[PDB]
């Protein structure tokens with residue numbers, strides 16, 4: 639698709655058997671999801687932006703479907719105010735910014 | 738251009754006759770720049786990010802070039818960790834996300 643930017647670019651995702659809404663964020667290095675269970679080992683991470691940092695759990699090799707497009711990569715889980723799809727998964731679905 | 742997302746989507750901007758680097762950010766409603774001087778009166782605004790909320794100064798109808806493309810619009814100035822070009826100006830330069 640071509641997604642214009644008049645509104646926030648929200649899409650449906652499927653992760654860990656669950657449907658969620660998430661923001662396509664070219665300004666995010668990483669993908670960050672609100673609290674949920676994921677399989678495998680994890681390690682803690684601190685991630686920052688406007689307002690400072692939050693602590694998250696890093697899970698690797700997680701399969702996600704983003705607007706119908708499957709992507710595997712790292713997902714961070716924690717008290718984010720918004721589910722965010724960051725560049726680590728945007729690249730995998732072939733997303734580009736065009737102007 | 739077509740900007741891929743394997744690296745941060747950093748571009749050069751021009752504001753107040755000065756070149757700066759900024760991040761093209763589809764996950765940002767607004768454009769937020771690190772402390773600098775702009776002309777005119779400002780109005781207060783609170784914005785939110787990953788970590789919480791911060792206060793910024795809102796300047797309207799600021800002339801700004803983004804990767805060579807001319808825009809005139811609202812610029813927020815405050816303690817952002819990074820200069821970000823948000824959707825208010827991405828729409829002025831005709832940017833879309835495509836996959």
Ligand SMILES: CCCC[C@@H](CN[C@@H](CCCC)C(=O)N[C@@H](CCC(N)=O)C(=O)N[C@@H](CCCNC(N)=[NH2+])C(N)=O)NC(=O)[C@@H](NC(=O)[C@@H](NC(C)=O)[C@@H](C)O)[C@@H](C)CC
Pocket residue numbers: 661663665666667668669670685686687688719720721722724760762764765766767768769783784785786787817818819821823
């Ligand atoms: C300034 C730092 C770079 C840009 C920023 C854009 N992220 C979006 C996230 C979505 C909201 C949580 C954002 O902050 N958007 C703001 C930008 C400010 C603005 N006004 O435009 C926004 O739209 N804020 C809205 C409110 C959105 C709330 N949304 C919601 N509740 N669903 C606002 N009007 O105040 N990126 C980030 O916050 C990411 N940070 C990073 O990628 C890097 N960190 C740093 C410090 O650069 C990396 C080294 O970790 C986070 C997610 C970690 C991976």
